[PDB]
């Protein structure tokens, strides 16, 4: 199936003294592989997946240089944006950046992206064509003009279509044993009685990878959304994911309801019953 590499960056200004708190994380699909935290002792980009430890000193030096350069851009931006938005030096503010590339089943470039937010709101993003920018307001418009004049988009497009894809393919090969493996959900169903007349059925999916999954209920073979509760997919903490969906039913009628599980680790959709 398709694959992605994505980087996420957050800086949070610290008004009273010193530089912003800066945190960078890198993912391939749903697996974190690197981190940098400005509060940590090492002041290096750090491995977070065993397959990235294959990379030598030059990689780690280069990624450290680049991530610190990222941190400094964010520091400058926080000051610029405070000015653009006529804000005081009293408050804490946040910049967030996300960029990366998607590839299809053939591992060829599909999509690239680069977006930026200030205080949790869209500021500026590269359009799908990787040639122009979406600016949310007049502040971002000024940035857009700056970036157009300096041909920023051209440099980013080269990275997103080239380097990003090249290194993603490299990571997928080095981490093949886990990165190219699917873990099918382990499914079961639980029952709870709320009263003499009402029952809760809960359909569980555990230990699955990647995170994308669909869980639905049917009643007598037709989709049932009413009286259901579906939790957000959550990390187990060991690299796999969990999810559940529950339905409230009349006591004695449990037989009418079936849970249906779709996941890339399952060739056929799975069905469960009480």
């Amino acid at each position: 199936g398709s694959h992605s590499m994505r980087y996420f960056f957050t800086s949070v200004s610290r008004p009273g003294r010193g530089e912003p708190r800066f945190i960078a994380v890198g993912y391939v699909d749903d697996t974190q592989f690197v981190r940098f935290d400005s509060d940590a002792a090492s002041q290096r980009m750090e491995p977070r997946a065993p397959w990235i430890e294959q990379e030598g000193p030059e990689y780690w030096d280069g990624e450290t240089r680049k991530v610190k350069a990222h941190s400094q851009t964010h520091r400058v931006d926080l000051g610029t944006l405070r000015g653009y938005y006529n804000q005081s030096e009293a408050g804490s503010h946040t910049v967030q950046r996300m960029y990366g590339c998607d590839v299809g089943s053939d591992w060829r470039f599909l999509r690239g992206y680069h977006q930026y937010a200030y205080d949790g709101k869209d500021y500026i993003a590269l359009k799908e064509d990787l040639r122009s920018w979406t600016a949310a307001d007049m502040a971002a418009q000024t940035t857009k003009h700056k970036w157009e004049a300096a041909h920023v988009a051209e440099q980013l497009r080269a990275y997103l279509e080239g380097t990003c894809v090249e290194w993603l393919r490299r990571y997928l090969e080095n981490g093949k044993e886990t990165l190219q493996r699917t873990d099918a959900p382990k499914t079961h169903m639980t029952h709870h009685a709320v009263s003499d007349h009402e029952a809760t059925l809960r359909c569980w999916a555990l230990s699955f990878y990647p995170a994308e999954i669909t869980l639905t209920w049917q009643r007598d073979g037709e989709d049932q959304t009413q009286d259901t509760e579906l939790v957000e997919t959550r990390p187990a903490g060991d690299g796999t994911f969990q999810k559940w969906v529950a339905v409230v039913v009349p006591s004695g009628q449990e037989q009418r309801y079936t849970c249906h599980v779709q996941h890339e680790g399952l060739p056929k959709p799975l069905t469960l019953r009480w």
């Binding site: 680049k66 851009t73 610029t80 960029y99 500021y123 500026i124 440099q155 380097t163 990003c164 290194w167």
Partner: peptide, 9 residues
């Protein structure tokens, strides 16, 4: 592998 350059706003 991180982007080589990040432009400021």
């Amino acid at each position: 592998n991180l982007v080589p350059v990040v432009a400021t706003v």
